[PDB]
Design an enzyme around this catalytic site. Sequence first.
Site, short mmCIF file in Angstrom:
data_model
loop_
_atom_site.label_atom_id
_atom_site.label_comp_id
_atom_site.label_asym_id
_atom_site.label_seq_id
_atom_site.Cartn_x
_atom_site.Cartn_y
_atom_site.Cartn_z
N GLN A 19 67.36 16.24 3.07
CA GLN A 19 67.51 15.05 2.54
C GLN A 19 68.79 14.88 1.71
O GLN A 19 69.35 13.88 1.51
CB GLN A 19 66.46 15.17 1.12
CG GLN A 19 66.80 16.12 0.01
CD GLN A 19 65.83 16.05 -1.00
OE1 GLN A 19 66.20 15.43 -2.00
NE2 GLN A 19 64.62 16.29 -1.20
N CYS A 25 63.28 12.48 -1.93
CA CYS A 25 62.13 13.47 -1.87
C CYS A 25 60.93 12.44 -1.57
O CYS A 25 60.29 12.93 -0.72
CB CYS A 25 61.74 14.12 -2.81
SG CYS A 25 61.31 13.47 -4.49
N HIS A 162 59.32 16.40 -7.60
CA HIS A 162 59.62 16.55 -6.15
C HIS A 162 58.54 16.14 -5.38
O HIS A 162 57.45 16.83 -5.40
CB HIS A 162 60.20 17.87 -5.99
CG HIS A 162 60.94 17.91 -4.79
ND1 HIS A 162 61.91 17.36 -4.23
CD2 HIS A 162 60.52 19.06 -3.85
CE1 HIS A 162 62.39 17.94 -3.01
NE2 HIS A 162 61.40 18.84 -2.70
N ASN A 182 59.25 21.38 3.08
CA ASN A 182 60.09 20.97 2.26
C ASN A 182 61.14 20.19 2.99
O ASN A 182 61.36 20.22 4.20
CB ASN A 182 60.54 21.81 1.48
CG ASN A 182 61.21 21.45 -0.08
OD1 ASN A 182 61.40 20.44 -0.28
ND2 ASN A 182 61.93 22.48 -0.73
C1 LIG Z 1 62.76 13.80 -5.78
C2 LIG Z 1 63.83 14.43 -5.09
O1 LIG Z 1 63.74 15.80 -5.13
O2 LIG Z 1 64.91 13.88 -4.19
C3 LIG Z 1 63.19 12.55 -6.35
O3 LIG Z 1 64.03 12.61 -7.59
C4 LIG Z 1 62.01 11.65 -6.76
O4 LIG Z 1 61.64 10.68 -6.21
N1 LIG Z 1 61.42 11.88 -8.12
C5 LIG Z 1 60.34 10.87 -8.69
C6 LIG Z 1 59.56 11.64 -9.69
C7 LIG Z 1 58.57 12.85 -9.10
C8 LIG Z 1 57.59 12.45 -8.11
C9 LIG Z 1 57.90 12.27 -6.95
C10 LIG Z 1 56.71 11.73 -6.25
C11 LIG Z 1 55.62 10.99 -6.89
C12 LIG Z 1 55.47 11.35 -8.44
C13 LIG Z 1 56.79 11.88 -8.88
C14 LIG Z 1 60.99 9.70 -9.60
O5 LIG Z 1 62.12 9.63 -10.22
N2 LIG Z 1 60.49 8.56 -9.24
C15 LIG Z 1 61.05 7.26 -9.85
C16 LIG Z 1 60.04 6.21 -9.87
C17 LIG Z 1 60.58 4.58 -9.53
C18 LIG Z 1 59.71 3.64 -9.68
C19 LIG Z 1 61.76 4.46 -10.45
#
Ligand SMILES: *[C@@H](C(=O)O)[C@H](O)C(=O)N[C@@H](CCc1ccccc1)C(=O)NCCC(C)C
Length: 215
Positions: A19, A25, A162, A182
């Site tokens: 990534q 992620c 993540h 991952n």
């Molecule tokens: C993951 C990464 O390591 O690249 C990236 O920060 C991410 O998408 N994090 C989300 C929170 C963690 C998570 C991921 C998937 C499902 C549930 C929780 C994140 O920040 N989500 C943002 C939501 C949008 C609608 C703004």
Amino acid sequence: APAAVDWRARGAVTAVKDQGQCGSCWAFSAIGNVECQWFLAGHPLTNLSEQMLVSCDKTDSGCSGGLMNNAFEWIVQENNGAVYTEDSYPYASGEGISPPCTTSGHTVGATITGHVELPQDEAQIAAWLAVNGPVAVAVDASSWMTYTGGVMTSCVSEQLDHGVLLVGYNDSAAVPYWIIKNSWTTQWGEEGYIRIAKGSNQCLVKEEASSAVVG
Ligand SMILES: *[C@@H](C(=O)O)[C@H](O)C(=O)N[C@@H](CCc1ccccc1)C(=O)NCCC(C)C
């Protein structure tokens, strides 16, 4: 089928990707699950495009994050079920930015019709995975920068940060574990993979499990 299931050993999982600096992620977890579900529906294993989601899915936030359930619904509701091949739309977000979406010049590699959200229970998730294949999950990966290999028998479990892909488990090992794909290259962990203990909600693995439905 109960004792141990490893979908990597059944030709159902693509190679480990990267990534980069993008907080994408969510897109790697959603596309890795679509690639596996497409193969298990009777189609050749094809590499699919995360960049399609990072650049074109406006119900999520590109390199600032997203959710696999919103990504699955964007594919069905806004992209007519289409998922492009990675070769026709390569990853372009490794420096931490997502270029503008391009809606043509790409080839459809797969299609999906919807998604399901699985129960918050590891035994129930193992049962579904054993038959229907790899599941997209969210974890607390805050302690994963120190992972050098083996089964992680204790994991910090406070906040989901993540999205990753569950590709198997082994209930017959000394400590039962989950096998997780991952997106931090093959130089991390066990050639890009991690094994965490199963049965005690390590890294909050049972909280946000889901999968695309193709057919
Ligand atoms: C993951 C990464 O390591 O690249 C990236 O920060 C991410 O998408 N994090 C989300 C929170 C963690 C998570 C991921 C998937 C499902 C549930 C929780 C994140 O920040 N989500 C943002 C939501 C949008 C609608 C703004």
